[PDB]
Write a protein that binds this ligand. Structure first.
Ligand SMILES: [Zn+2]
Lengths: 144, 49, 49, 48, 57
């Protein structure tokens, strides 16, 4: 079905964590961030990947990547993951609480989280992306 | 030949100026505009280094 | 006055950083003027001087 | 103006200032340009 | 929302370490006056490429 076709499309499709995040604020002090996500059914229209999958992927992989980018900018400026709080029931905000030595130089955390979420993938068949459907009444899928 | 000297250097070298004068000239408005404030701070700090 | 303008300049630069200003187009007769003959003539003349 | 208001989403009797803000908001991007002009082009082509 | 000295302009070091003193002017200041420094940082507009943003424009 067209429903089944669109489903299968979304399945083979890849998507990045940034494609779901709304505006994000990071709170300074303690070093705490809270992300906004889009509403679950509006989340499952353009998608249909699941909430617990968001939890799993966000937590592990996004924390890893964020730590990578933080450490690397720390290495350039030279010249730990403390707390996680996801909206486990409603799935509509993602707080992460980080703690840092006070001696370090400031951080453009805004650009950092944006770079992070724009980098981590939720699910991607390796080396494929952008599956679409384009019409002779011949149901076909056209994938880059 | 190209030559790269930090802006903060030539700034404090231009006028006998206090860093507070820099900060209140650069973003002195709308006190605590997030982006401008944190970037300017980083700049003053990295020159102070 | 150089100092004040440097301030204005870095201020505009940061505004551009955060998308608070559209990119000036150097590829447009808007951001452009003309060189004459006599002027470059005087400049190279001064150079040889 | 018909295709314009339609693509933006406002109606043809919409207030001038509202559509003004919309259009300024539109073609600071480019995809919004692409869609808008694509609509306008289909429309003019129909007429033509 | 920053901490400059008034004798020197030295951008002072964080007080959550200890009492505040500028490294050059060596001026003493009450550290607790400006405790609880809040900077509420917000992502700038047009920052997240959506698949629904056009439905919001
Ligand atoms: Zn001082």
């Amino acid at each position: 079905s067209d429903k089944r076709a669109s489903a299968f499309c979304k399945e083979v499709n890849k998507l990045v964590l940034s494609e779901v995040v709304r505006q994000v604020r990071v709170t300074e002090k303690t070093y705490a961030i809270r992300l906004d996500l889009y509403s679950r059914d509006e989340y499952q229209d353009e998608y249909g990947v699941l909430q617990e999958e968001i939890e799993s992927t966000f937590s592990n992989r996004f924390l890893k990547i964020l730590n990578r980018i933080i450490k690397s900018y720390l290495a350039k400026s030279k010249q730990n993951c403390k707390h996680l709080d996801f909206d486990y029931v409603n799935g509509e905000w993602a707080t992460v609480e980080l703690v840092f030595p006070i001696n370090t130089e400031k951080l453009l955390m805004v650009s950092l989280v944006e770079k992070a979420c724009s980098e981590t993938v939720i699910h991607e068949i390796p080396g494929i992306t952008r599956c679409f459907s384009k019409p002779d009444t011949v149901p076909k899928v056209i994938t880059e | 030949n190209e030559y790269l000297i930090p802006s903060m250097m030539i700034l404090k070298a231009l006028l006998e100026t206090s860093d507070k004068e820099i900060f209140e000239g650069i973003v002195g408005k709308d006190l605590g505009n997030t982006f401008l404030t944190d970037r300017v701070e980083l700049m003053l700090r990295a020159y102070k280094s | 006055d150089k100092f004040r303008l440097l301030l204005f300049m870095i201020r505009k630069l940061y505004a551009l950083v955060a998308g608070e200003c559209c990119a000036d187009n150097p590829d447009s007769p808007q951001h452009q003027e003309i060189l004459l003959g006599g002027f470059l003539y005087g400049q190279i003349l001064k150079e040889k001087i | 103006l018909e295709a314009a208001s339609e693509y933006v989403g406002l109606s043809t009797d919409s207030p001038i200032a509202l559509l003004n803000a919309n259009l300024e908001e539109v073609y600071r991007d480019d995809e919004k340009l692409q869609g808008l002009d694509a609509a306008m082009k289909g429309k003019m082509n129909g007429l033509t | 929302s920053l901490i400059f000295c008034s004798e020197c302009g030295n951008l002072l070091e964080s007080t959550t370490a200890q009492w505040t003193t500028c490294d050059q002017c060596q001026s003493v200041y009450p550290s607790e006056q400006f405790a609880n420094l809040v900077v509420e940082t917000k992502s700038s507009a047009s920052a997240f490429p959506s698949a629904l943003k056009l439905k919001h424009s």
